[PDB]
Amino acid sequence: MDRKVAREFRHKVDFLIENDAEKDYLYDVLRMYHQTMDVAVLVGDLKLVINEPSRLPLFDAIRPLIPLKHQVEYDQLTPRRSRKLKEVRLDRLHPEGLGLSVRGGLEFGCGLFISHLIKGGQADSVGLQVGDEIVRINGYSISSCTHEEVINLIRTEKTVSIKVRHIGLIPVKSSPDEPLTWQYVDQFVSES
């Protein structure tokens, strides 16, 4: 079985990672994990290559490689994702607002992400999360929208419906000349 598992895993690695040095690092940290069985260190080391949304399926690809006794902890330490979309209905005329912050848009080359949550607020109460990507506002696709257009679209009606996909990463660009990078929720929240 281990030549079949290796074959299927290798196909997933080649598809999601272009660079050979990044592949070599990936296989090396997995080799180290097999020796030490330190799952926390593994997930921490994996983050160096799993550094953008398109690379997150690697966590799914790696999970079968993880022995049964560590799969619960592995799931806890990795972002919880699902291809099923979550829909919520929010009231803009609420005295305390929506209770969330939002960053991103087409001009940044990234989607729209919830970056802050007010604990006990309206967004929080409906189960929205820091790291959620907004994929739909009032029924509309926002893949071709700038930041301002999305904000204006949210403010069109007295109420707003948001469809959400949990990613667990936040886009970062501290100046107009900086490249777009990604931070895991825990880092972004701690540094804010």
Next chain:
Amino acid sequence: ETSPLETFLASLHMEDFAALLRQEKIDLEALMLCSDLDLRSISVPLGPREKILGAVRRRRQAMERPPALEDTEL
């Protein structure tokens, strides 16, 4: 599921102009290149014409000179 033009016009409270624009074979890519005269010629009134044109300009400036990523509090 919705077109770039449909969402663009929806953010401007101008959904009702989507029928006219699609009829004149104008998608968002084409609209970005529309002058005041172009929209005048297809019977777009002054108020709506200036709203569209302003939004095109803001879109172009954001795409060409994107700032730092910042959070909008809602």
